[PDB]
A paper describes a structure:
[name] is a heme enzyme that catalyzes the reduction of nitric oxide (NO) to nitrous oxide (N2O) in the nitrogen cycle (2NO + NADH + H+ → N2O + NAD+ + H2O). In the first reaction, the water molecule at the sixth coordination site is displaced by NO, forming the ferric NO complex as an initial intermediate. The ferric NO complex is then reduced with hydride (H−) from NADH, producing the second intermediate, intermediate-I (I).
The structure of the resting enzyme consists of two molecules (A and B chains) in the asymmetric unit. The structure of the active site of the resting enzyme, as obtained by the [name] technique ([name] structure), is illustrated in Fig. 4a. The coordination of the water molecule in resting [name] is consistent with the reported structure determined by synchrotron X-rays (synchrotron structure) at cryogenic temperatures. c map indicated open and closed multiple conformations for the F-helix and FG-loop region, which is the entrance of the channel for NADH to the heme pocket. These types of multiple conformations in the NADH channel have never been reported, which can be explained by the difference in space group between the used micro-crystals here and the previously used large crystals. No differences were observed among the protein moieties of all [name] structures obtained in the TR-[name] experiments at ambient temperature.
Author numbering: 5 to 403
The structure:
């Protein structure tokens, strides 16, 4: 059995194994970092089944749960938030914070989203690139999702820049473990203090809603509220940064499609749908353990055996998406959903927010900077390490 996670075939490409497995062995065993074996599911139809089957569990203290690193195994010990829950606990807690992420709520947030993107682009203009390229990640891709999610949680304007930097330090590949866990402690301590404040005078933010509607009635206590606020911050932010940077890089590699976006910014939604299919930047989140024996394709998954469902592989499934390895924002979409955001009950709570952010960015970026260009050769883009989720560490641009 091959070791898993697989490495990406190159900087922007998924692992090569998935294509071979989809054609010859779509449900296979892989070897995890700790020698334990797990089942790997690679086809769109089977990913959808894993994501929704009531015989499979996300509870991480069940025997056989497939942790991919040593830190996930100790992370498993902490009191769980709804990302690691099964029904009916899962939706009991998830529904406490879902109101802010509904399509209606996200529609009302659109003016604020546009203003955040506008402001940060204008800052970047004023900084200019008269002394060399600027890092689109640091100047724009990192603060855009960071400022929005922090603001929704209830962080006041003056604290945004410091906390944005701390959260970036958490997941920066060149941080030592001491730097990353200190940045991590910094974030938890700040949220605990903000929870204490909102318990005394609530405002109009997610933490205030949790304090008022759940903590004070006793449905949860303040430490649960900190953990839920922390989950909402860290679950999607690094992914959002990578999607933004990956969109810019992808457009630089497909000049003809960038020219269409420049001449019709209303194509941004369709560009965003294809970006999220093609660059599946969160590909290791759909994991389960089997509560009972369960049949997936021609394999029997025994109870207490772990499953990993690759939505990355599913998004390149030739049986669903014609010419899946071509980036085509003008593609015709089948009936089946792309799985960039997962599937079923656990499907990314922030799907509508994330798409509205991505769509606002790509309908605005090139209207502001019609000559935005990646300043290094495309073969020299600094992608994330090949053993991690696809992403871009830094992206020098001129405009
Ligand atoms: C392009 C950006 C993003 C992508 C591609 C993405 C992707 C995903 C994926 C694949 C999952 C697993 C879903 C499943 O189990 O079926 C997920 C879950 C989740 N995401 Fe996102 N995400 C993004 C942005 C965000 C943001 C901005 C937030 C928070 C503000 C967020 C919060 C969550 C949470 C809380 C879950 C767990 C939901 C649950 O288990 O009920 N994500 N996301």
């Amino acid at each position: 059995a091959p070791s898993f996670p697989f490495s990406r075939a190159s900087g922007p490409e998924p692992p090569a194994e998935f294509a071979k497995l989809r054609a010859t062995n779509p449900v296979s065993q892989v070897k995890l970092f700790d020698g334990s074996l797990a089942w790997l599911v690679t086809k769109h139809k089977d990913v959808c089944f894993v994501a929704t089957s009531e015989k499979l569990s996300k509870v991480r203290t069940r025997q056989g749960f497939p942790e991919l690193s040593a830190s996930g195994k100790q992370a498993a010990k902490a009191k769980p938030t709804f990302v690691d829950m099964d029904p009916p606990e899962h939706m009991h807690q998830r529904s406490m914070v879902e109101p802010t992420f509904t399509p209606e709520a996200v529609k009302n947030l659109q003016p604020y989203i546009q203003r955040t993107v506008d402001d940060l682009l204008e800052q970047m203009k004023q900084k200019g690139c008269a002394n060399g390229p600027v890092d689109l990640v640091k100047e724009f891709a990192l603060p855009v999702p960071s400022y929005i999610i922090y603001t929704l949680l209830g962080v006041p304007f003056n604290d945004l820049e410091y906390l944005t930097q701390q959260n970036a330090i958490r997941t920066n590949g060149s941080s030592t473990a001491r730097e990353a866990s200190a940045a991590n402690q910094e974030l938890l301590d700040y949220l605990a203090i903000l929870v204490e404040q909102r318990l005394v005078e609530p405002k109009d933010d997610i933490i205030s809603k949790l304090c008022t509607e759940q903590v004070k009635p006793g449905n949860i206590d303040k430490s649960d509220a900190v953990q839920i606020a922390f989950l909402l911050l860290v679950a999607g932010n690094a992914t959002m940064v990578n999607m933004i940077a990956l969109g810019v890089a992808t457009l630089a590699q497909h000049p003809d499609q960038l020219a269409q976006l420049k001449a019709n910014p209303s194509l941004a939604p369709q560009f965003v749908e294809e970006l999220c299919r093609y660059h599946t930047a969160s590909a290791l989140a759909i994991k389960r353990t089997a509560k009972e024996d369960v049949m997936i394709g021609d394999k029997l998954v025994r109870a207490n055996e772990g499953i990993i469902a690759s939505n990355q592989s599913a998004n390149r499934d030739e049986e669903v998406f014609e010419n899946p390895d071509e980036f085509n924002m003008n593609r015709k979409w089948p009936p089946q959903d792309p799985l960039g955001f997962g599937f079923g009950d656990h499907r990314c709570i922030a799907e509508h927010l994330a798409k509205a952010e991505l769509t606002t960015v790509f309908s605005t970026l090139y209207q502001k900077f019609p000559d935005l260009k990646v300043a290094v050769p495309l073969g020299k883009i600094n992608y994330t390490p090949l053993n991690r989720d696809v992403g871009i560490v830094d992206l020098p641009v001129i405009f």
